[PDB]
Amino acid sequence: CSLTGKWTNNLGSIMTIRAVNSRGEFTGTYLTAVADNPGNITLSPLLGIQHKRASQPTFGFTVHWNFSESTTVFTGQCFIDRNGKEVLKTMWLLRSSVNDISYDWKATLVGYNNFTRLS
Amino acid sequence: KCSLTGKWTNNLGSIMTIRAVNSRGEFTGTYLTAVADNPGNITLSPLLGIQHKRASQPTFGFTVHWNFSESTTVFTGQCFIDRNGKEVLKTMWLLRSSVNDISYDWKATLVGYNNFTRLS
Amino acid sequence: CSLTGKWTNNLGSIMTIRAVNSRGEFTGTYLTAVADNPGNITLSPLLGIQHKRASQPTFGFTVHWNFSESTTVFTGQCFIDRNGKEVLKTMWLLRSSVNDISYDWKATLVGYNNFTRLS
Amino acid sequence: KCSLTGKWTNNLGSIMTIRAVNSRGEFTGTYLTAVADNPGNITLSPLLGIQHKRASQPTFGFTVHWNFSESTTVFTGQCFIDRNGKEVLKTMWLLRSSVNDISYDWKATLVGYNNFTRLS
Numbered sequence: 107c108s109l110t111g112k113w114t115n116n117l118g119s120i121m122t123i124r125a126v127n128s129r130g131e132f133t134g135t136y137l138t139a140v141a142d143n144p145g146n147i148t149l150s151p152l153l154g155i156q157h158k159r160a161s162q163p164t165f166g167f168t169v170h171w172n173f174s175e176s177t178t179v180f181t182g183q184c185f186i187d188r189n190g191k192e193v194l195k196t197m198w199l200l201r202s203s204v205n206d207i208s209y210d211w212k213a214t215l216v217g218y219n220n221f222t223r224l225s
Numbered sequence: 226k227c228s229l230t231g232k233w234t235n236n237l238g239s240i241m242t243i244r245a246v247n248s249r250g251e252f253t254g255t256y257l258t259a260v261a262d263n264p265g266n267i268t269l270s271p272l273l274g275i276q277h278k279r280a281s282q283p284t285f286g287f288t289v290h291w292n293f294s295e296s297t298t299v300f301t302g303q304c305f306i307d308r309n310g311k312e313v314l315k316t317m318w319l320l321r322s323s324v325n326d327i328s329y330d331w332k333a334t335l336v337g338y339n340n341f342t343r344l345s
Numbered sequence: 346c347s348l349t350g351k352w353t354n355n356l357g358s359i360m361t362i363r364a365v366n367s368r369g370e371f372t373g374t375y376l377t378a379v380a381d382n383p384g385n386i387t388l389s390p391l392l393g394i395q396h397k398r399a400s401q402p403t404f405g406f407t408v409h410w411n412f413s414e415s416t417t418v419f420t421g422q423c424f425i426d427r428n429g430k431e432v433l434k435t436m437w438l439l440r441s442s443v444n445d446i447s448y449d450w451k452a453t454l455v456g457y458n459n460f461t462r463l464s
Numbered sequence: 465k466c467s468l469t470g471k472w473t474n475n476l477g478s479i480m481t482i483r484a485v486n487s488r489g490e491f492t493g494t495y496l497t498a499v500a501d502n503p504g505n506i507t508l509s510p511l512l513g514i515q516h517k518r519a520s521q522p523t524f525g526f527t528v529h530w531n532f533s534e535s536t537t538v539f540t541g542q543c544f545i546d547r548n549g550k551e552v553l554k555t556m557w558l559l560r561s562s563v564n565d566i567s568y569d570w571k572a573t574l575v576g577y578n579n580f581t582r583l584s
């Protein structure tokens with residue numbers, strides 16, 4: 107269950123993840139299929155850490171959107187079924203930029219995503 | 226302006242130390258949690274994240290790989306600067322526990338908040 | 346998109362909801378397919394409110410688990426597709442009972458559920 | 465023991481009033497939020513929920529049907545009593561916005577926290 111490779115989720119987004127180093131750290135690139143303003147979407151870098159020893163590791167990563175002031179974090183676990191098929195089960199928080207601390211209450215969206223490997 | 230570099234404490238008493246933020250907004254550091262499911266096992270743990278660079282009050286996210294647990298936490302939030310120049314990180318977090326198989330996935334994710342201010 | 350009726354979700358849970366009154370309030374009964382201790386599962390009452398005027402209303406409800414000290418809240422929206430098929434898209438928070446306020450940080454689980462009508 | 469009956473204020477300044485808790489733990493009341501997406505539209509709004517009855521520090525949940533918005537909020541939490549008998553509600557919430565169709569569902573749910581103490 108190395109996060110290295112190419113993935114798609116239930117919203118149609120795709121991400122590519124590079125080699126996971128000995129500390130479990132990885133970089134990659136995220137293409138979201140959806141956005142507040144979808145006409146603005148550009149490829150956005152991600153940076154995260156997975157656990158290394160576990161066969162079905164937990165992990166987290168941050169996506170710095172390159173077309174928005176927002177940021178998303180994803181966390182989840184990679185599972186392997188009896189046929190060797192991998193799924194990333196994740197939850198996410200999406201932080202929007204607000205003007206000052208008095209607007210903080212409305213700044214964080216939550217959701218889920220299930221990822222599978224592209225071919 | 227708001228750079229996450231430096232030492233911070235939160236409302237639970239945890240301490241984190243963030244190193245240099247690079248020109249992409251990437252940063253690393255360490256996180257010493259005050260609380261855990263098994264606090265007798267707590268050890269200093271690494272974090273890795275990204276903040277926005279241009280904004281004076283940037284949003285950001287980071288991941289903490291706990292070195293004593295199979296779990297992982299992610300934090301996201303915004304750094305605010307008030308009229309006196311005091312900085313606060315307002316964050317929300319998700320903590321993913323390791324479960325045995327996908328049938329237990331539903332119970333694997335905790336949610337919460339944390340407010341951080343600077344040590345010094 | 347009246348919540349009245351019989352529903353199942355992606356985890357295999359089922360719920361039955363009674364008549365929605367003029368204020369949008371409803372009661373019902375929830376049978377979860379999963380629990381921390383599944384051998385203890387019993388039917389549990391729910392109580393909530395939906396919006397009335399909207400064709401695709403938002404709503405919320407609370408489930409008082411009758412076999413646990415925990416409580417779950419669900420919120421979401423009822424959608425109708427081109428064929429007239431309804432789906433409840435929901436997110437939930439599950440509050441566990443902890444001993445004192447110093448344990449509060451670990452007391453709230455989050456997740457999703459998609460519900461469809463039973464037949 | 466902890467009955468949600470009475471008036472409470474939260475960290476955002478909102479006020480809610482909970483009526484009698486029945487023998488099932490069900491309660492109704494009203495919620496006056498201090499903040500909204502469009503605060504010029506705020507009106508007093510009804511809530512309905514259930515708490516546990518036997519526990520001295522019960523968990524609970526409630527739904528607020530905003531009377532001025534198509535959105536709905538749910539809150540869940542626990543009532544704690546400290547060594548001096550002071551009560552605090554520690555809660556987390558989800559706020560569901562109304563979106564036009566299912567393709568926008570992903571952006572429809574906000575999350576947050578609130579801490580409540582008694583008015584009086």
Ligand SMILES: O=C(CCCC[C@@H]1SC[C@@H]2NC(=O)N[C@@H]21)Nc1ccc([N+](=O)[O-])cc1
Binds near residue numbers: 176
């Ligand atoms: O649009 C944005 C930036 C792109 C976010 C894509 C999200 S990441 C969670 C989910 N999973 C995906 O694969 N893609 C979506 N930011 C944003 C979105 C909504 C709002 N809003 O106010 O609703 C503000 C900023």
Ligand SMILES: O=C(CCCC[C@@H]1SC[C@@H]2NC(=O)N[C@@H]21)Nc1ccc([N+](=O)[O-])cc1
Binds near residue numbers: 291
């Ligand atoms: O205990 C752990 C690892 C350490 C988590 C510390 C959390 S990070 C969010 C919050 N903010 C802090 O500063 N500290 C806390 N993992 C864990 C926790 C609970 C459960 N559980 O099942 O409840 C399983 C694993």
Ligand SMILES: O=C(CCCC[C@@H]1SC[C@@H]2NC(=O)N[C@@H]21)Nc1ccc([N+](=O)[O-])cc1
Binds near residue numbers: 378379381
């Ligand atoms: O087990 C319980 C009570 C039953 C909860 C069922 C949940 S409601 C969200 C989800 N959707 C469903 O249809 N069913 C599940 N409470 C509980 C669960 C886990 C923990 N825990 O610590 O992990 C503590 C209490």
Ligand SMILES: O=C(CCCC[C@@H]1SC[C@@H]2NC(=O)N[C@@H]21)Nc1ccc([N+](=O)[O-])cc1
Binds near residue numbers: 478499530535578
């Ligand atoms: O504004 C609204 C309706 C009022 C919500 C008040 C929230 S309930 C959680 C928090 N605790 C409080 O005491 N008050 C706040 N709905 C709404 C809000 C934001 C958005 N949005 O898109 O950001 C859409 C609808």
